[PDB]
Amino acid sequence: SSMEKRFAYKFLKKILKYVDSAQEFIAHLEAIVSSGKTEKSPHDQEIKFFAKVLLPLVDQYFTNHHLYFLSSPLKPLSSSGYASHKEKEMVASLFCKLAALVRHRISLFGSDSTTMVSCLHILAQTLDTRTVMKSGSELVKAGLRAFFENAAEDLEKTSENLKLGKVSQNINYTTVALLPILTSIFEHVAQHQFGVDLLLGDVQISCYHILCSLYSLGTGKNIYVERQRPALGECLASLAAAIPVAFLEPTLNRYNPLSVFNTKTPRERSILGMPDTVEEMCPDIPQLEGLMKEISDLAESGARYTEMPHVIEVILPMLCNYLSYWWERGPEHLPPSTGPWCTKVTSEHLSVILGNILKIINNNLGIDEASWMKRIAVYAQPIISKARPDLLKSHFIPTLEKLKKKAVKTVQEEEQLKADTKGDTQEAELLILDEFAVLCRDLYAFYPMLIRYVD
């Protein structure tokens, strides 16, 4: 019969109606808070039901029937079936409305902010932007395109506040809600390959602004930056693996048909208030050659994580994802594409970057406290596949030899300590336990790369 009698359609319609009512309820609650009245809200029952039953229910429902809303006739991911166009549009609209509700009201939500953010994670991972954009009501498309604009505005406002500061609500919202949701959205559109259909035109401009703001925050020297470097690096890495414009190689941008500069008339681009040249879109972000040269100099000099805390948590993941994404669109993976490419990335760049990562891990070997290794071992996975054979003699064997020497030294010390029962053996036992802990950390920060290379 009609597709409007399905259970999922009714469920989503009911939840959308409840979210629409909760919009007014939250607006009135914020108004009464501004007025200073401390009495309970007249619709406290509705708020309690929405925050205690509706959100966890939606989260669980889309954690269970997750593939059903992503599958399509072309790709049958779910055995149960595939959601209709209207249901996918409803899911996108619900995600947009929820993101609108918590845009700056994390303080109002209080204890339910975590539940709201988890529900937003689940909805973002269950978004089919392709079908929504192809066949969806103009309101839903407008909301989806305005989500990225709102995120860009919020990030620019946070950067401005950090510069002016010598406010806390906005940084709290950015840390708690905005960054994880952006990371989830970009990972979802990168693994399912929605980037070539979603991040175009206005969305691409908003992504340019987001990229500039994230790079500015990540490499800055601030208390907030010092605390949130990992999140900024992860979000930037996710963005670099989905946006279809080579933002580190603007000189070849004329060969990229997916860029706004090559897909929009100059009058239209000037109407949108963007610079007339791609060189000015990301003025602060260096070119690919500059980043690679800086990383090589840092690795060869011997600097530790303290000297380059932003070349290890922001620049490196972005570079790894960028190289992995653009290798498949470069000279090596496009033999028949005799025409010039929008990138100049070959396996040489991936090999040299992997070698620099290994050298950096080697320099920081045995440091007392370095928790960045367990992330650098995860952000190098995309580029281990293109590593060249010469890495075996120059970078893998020396590092493993250093690790083996450390292990033999520590085990000999432990055996000699156990043999001798004189003196205070408890302090020596604690010291050797600390040494074993640092050795295990170093092994698990280098062994994954070795295993991939061997495989």
XYZ file of C-alpha atoms in Angstrom, residues 21-327:
307
model
C 6.830 21.369 20.027
C 10.079 21.146 22.000
C 11.428 24.031 19.926
C 8.717 26.329 21.294
C 9.072 24.860 24.782
C 12.830 25.498 24.836
C 12.364 29.012 23.457
C 9.873 29.800 26.226
C 12.158 28.228 28.838
C 15.053 30.399 27.671
C 12.785 33.454 27.750
C 11.715 32.744 31.337
C 15.358 32.151 32.287
C 16.260 35.529 30.786
C 13.407 37.168 32.706
C 14.872 35.706 35.914
C 11.856 33.630 36.962
C 12.957 30.478 38.796
C 9.591 28.695 38.787
C 9.153 25.362 37.033
C 8.177 25.591 33.381
C 4.473 25.033 32.604
C 5.486 22.370 30.046
C 7.960 20.587 32.332
C 6.188 17.293 31.617
C 6.822 17.707 27.890
C 10.469 18.628 28.464
C 11.017 15.660 30.777
C 9.411 13.281 28.282
C 11.436 14.724 25.401
C 14.765 14.606 27.241
C 14.243 11.307 29.093
C 12.300 9.092 26.650
C 12.365 10.542 23.138
C 16.102 11.112 22.705
C 17.345 7.720 24.000
C 14.552 6.031 22.063
C 15.623 7.725 18.824
C 19.265 6.907 19.537
C 18.521 3.215 20.055
C 16.156 3.040 17.076
C 18.757 4.424 14.688
C 21.496 2.321 16.266
C 19.404 -0.766 15.485
C 17.854 0.105 12.108
C 20.927 1.986 10.945
C 21.682 0.285 7.619
C 17.998 0.337 6.638
C 18.119 4.131 6.278
C 21.429 4.113 4.372
C 20.731 1.331 1.880
C 19.422 2.099 -1.596
C 18.491 0.004 -4.658
C 22.029 0.450 -5.991
C 23.594 -0.637 -2.672
C 21.566 -3.126 -0.560
C 23.435 -2.772 2.728
C 20.510 -3.961 4.872
C 18.795 -7.309 4.369
C 15.524 -5.925 5.754
C 15.146 -3.408 2.936
C 15.857 0.204 2.081
C 14.116 3.281 3.428
C 11.983 5.301 1.048
C 12.941 8.793 -0.079
C 10.498 10.435 2.326
C 11.925 8.575 5.325
C 15.481 9.613 4.437
C 14.343 13.217 4.050
C 12.675 12.979 7.465
C 15.871 11.628 9.031
C 17.887 14.500 7.561
C 15.293 17.034 8.724
C 15.296 15.544 12.225
C 19.086 15.734 12.423
C 19.043 19.357 11.277
C 16.335 20.318 13.780
C 18.117 18.599 16.670
C 21.362 20.343 15.732
C 19.412 23.609 15.713
C 17.992 22.964 19.193
C 21.370 22.541 20.897
C 23.199 25.235 18.913
C 23.991 27.359 21.962
C 21.770 25.819 24.662
C 24.117 23.228 26.164
C 23.843 25.042 29.496
C 20.039 24.918 29.355
C 20.076 21.184 28.634
C 22.574 20.530 31.413
C 22.682 16.811 32.146
C 20.933 15.936 28.861
C 23.580 17.533 26.632
C 25.415 14.204 26.496
C 22.248 12.416 25.374
C 21.561 15.102 22.771
C 25.097 14.810 21.401
C 24.886 11.010 21.280
C 21.595 11.208 19.387
C 23.206 13.680 16.988
C 26.114 11.271 16.471
C 23.717 8.457 15.611
C 21.639 10.606 13.259
C 24.740 11.965 11.511
C 26.039 8.446 10.924
C 22.618 7.506 9.467
C 22.403 10.325 6.913
C 22.053 9.681 3.178
C 22.820 13.144 1.834
C 22.909 11.887 -1.762
C 19.254 10.845 -1.945
C 18.169 13.886 0.074
C 19.889 16.275 -2.331
C 18.695 14.399 -5.422
C 15.010 14.177 -4.408
C 14.114 16.175 -1.313
C 11.968 19.119 -0.336
C 13.690 22.483 -0.616
C 13.312 23.045 3.131
C 15.354 19.940 3.963
C 18.092 20.865 1.489
C 18.146 24.399 2.884
C 18.540 23.057 6.411
C 21.318 20.676 5.400
C 23.209 23.434 3.590
C 22.666 25.841 6.492
C 24.042 23.409 9.074
C 27.547 23.816 7.652
C 27.107 27.586 7.419
C 26.109 27.698 11.088
C 29.101 25.536 12.005
C 31.428 27.838 10.058
C 29.958 30.900 11.767
C 30.353 29.297 15.193
C 33.963 28.326 14.509
C 34.827 31.820 13.271
C 33.150 33.313 16.346
C 35.154 31.003 18.609
C 38.376 32.021 16.860
C 37.447 35.695 17.255
C 36.669 35.226 20.953
C 39.976 33.436 21.516
C 41.846 36.268 19.800
C 40.021 38.989 21.746
C 40.234 37.146 25.074
C 43.140 38.204 27.279
C 32.719 33.555 25.558
C 33.196 30.515 27.781
C 29.728 29.315 26.774
C 30.655 29.365 23.085
C 33.936 27.520 23.644
C 32.115 24.958 25.789
C 29.590 24.418 22.993
C 32.380 24.071 20.434
C 34.256 21.555 22.577
C 31.226 19.480 23.573
C 28.769 19.551 20.667
C 30.100 21.110 17.470
C 33.434 19.349 16.969
C 32.258 15.744 17.573
C 29.252 16.243 15.294
C 31.415 17.724 12.540
C 33.843 14.823 12.889
C 31.020 12.291 12.635
C 29.496 14.022 9.604
C 32.791 14.198 7.738
C 33.772 10.614 8.553
C 30.333 9.458 7.403
C 30.486 11.372 4.114
C 34.071 10.218 3.569
C 33.598 6.491 4.159
C 30.360 6.346 2.144
C 31.770 8.697 -0.519
C 29.131 11.426 -0.373
C 31.765 14.158 -0.576
C 31.725 14.460 -4.366
C 27.963 15.108 -4.211
C 27.527 17.062 -0.954
C 30.484 19.447 -0.530
C 29.782 21.502 -3.648
C 29.052 25.193 -4.056
C 27.692 26.773 -0.886
C 28.575 23.709 1.183
C 32.090 23.870 -0.256
C 32.438 27.540 0.698
C 31.286 26.737 4.227
C 33.800 23.884 4.324
C 36.525 26.307 3.229
C 35.651 28.553 6.166
C 35.552 25.575 8.543
C 38.942 24.380 7.303
C 40.550 27.792 7.736
C 39.113 28.187 11.241
C 40.158 24.687 12.320
C 43.698 25.148 11.025
C 43.940 28.543 12.727
C 42.762 27.163 16.076
C 44.857 24.001 15.928
C 48.221 25.666 15.334
C 47.658 28.587 17.705
C 49.172 29.021 21.163
C 46.306 29.286 23.656
C 44.998 27.518 26.741
C 41.923 26.324 24.854
C 44.111 25.251 21.931
C 46.463 23.455 24.316
C 43.508 21.526 25.728
C 41.695 20.832 22.438
C 44.519 20.122 19.979
C 43.534 16.423 19.626
C 39.903 17.223 18.791
C 40.895 19.942 16.323
C 43.381 17.608 14.668
C 40.812 14.828 14.371
C 38.161 17.152 12.933
C 40.655 18.613 10.457
C 41.733 15.119 9.408
C 38.108 14.136 8.834
C 37.508 17.281 6.784
C 40.580 16.664 4.622
C 39.366 13.147 3.751
C 36.017 14.321 2.370
C 36.303 17.791 0.821
C 36.897 17.303 -2.926
C 39.171 20.332 -3.425
C 42.951 20.123 -3.054
C 43.380 22.975 -0.585
C 47.157 22.457 -0.403
C 47.704 22.540 -4.196
C 45.834 25.610 -5.460
C 48.200 26.074 -8.414
C 46.509 23.139 -10.185
C 42.968 24.069 -9.122
C 42.126 24.896 -12.748
C 42.152 21.132 -13.422
C 39.569 20.299 -10.737
C 36.009 20.306 -12.159
C 34.436 19.997 -8.687
C 35.728 23.329 -7.370
C 33.425 26.336 -7.204
C 35.992 28.379 -9.130
C 35.551 26.003 -12.086
C 31.826 25.312 -11.607
C 30.388 28.806 -11.018
C 30.421 31.961 -13.099
C 32.729 34.737 -11.842
C 29.750 37.034 -11.254
C 28.058 34.427 -9.056
C 31.270 33.812 -7.109
C 31.696 37.554 -6.561
C 28.077 37.714 -5.366
C 28.960 35.164 -2.671
C 31.746 37.429 -1.396
C 34.710 35.146 -2.071
C 38.157 36.183 -3.326
C 38.655 36.209 -7.085
C 41.573 33.750 -6.799
C 41.817 30.342 -5.143
C 45.161 31.422 -3.670
C 43.345 33.629 -1.149
C 40.722 31.092 -0.020
C 43.133 29.555 2.525
C 45.866 32.181 2.948
C 47.302 30.843 6.206
C 47.387 27.150 5.239
C 50.773 26.441 3.610
C 51.199 24.562 0.367
C 51.901 20.836 0.286
C 55.614 21.330 -0.381
C 55.980 23.727 2.540
C 54.303 21.346 4.976
C 56.380 18.400 3.792
C 59.612 20.394 4.061
C 58.727 21.582 7.570
C 57.912 18.042 8.699
C 61.147 16.727 7.189
C 63.217 19.416 8.912
C 61.573 18.707 12.267
C 62.089 14.951 11.903
C 65.728 15.188 10.818
C 66.681 17.789 13.434
C 65.540 15.565 16.291
C 62.917 17.735 17.999
C 60.583 16.215 20.574
C 56.839 16.609 21.041
C 57.275 19.721 23.186
C 59.012 21.573 20.348
C 56.388 20.627 17.722
C 53.126 19.888 19.553
C 51.060 21.102 16.587
C 53.046 19.367 13.823
C 52.103 16.065 15.476
C 48.443 16.562 16.470
C 47.058 18.826 13.722
C 49.283 19.004 10.650
C 50.276 15.335 10.497
C 46.783 13.732 10.503
C 45.532 16.245 7.952
C 48.539 15.562 5.730
C 48.107 11.791 6.003
C 44.416 11.901 5.087
C 45.049 14.441 2.321
C 47.777 12.315 0.741
C 45.707 9.142 1.004
C 42.680 10.829 -0.569
C 44.565 12.534 -3.399
C 46.881 9.657 -4.295
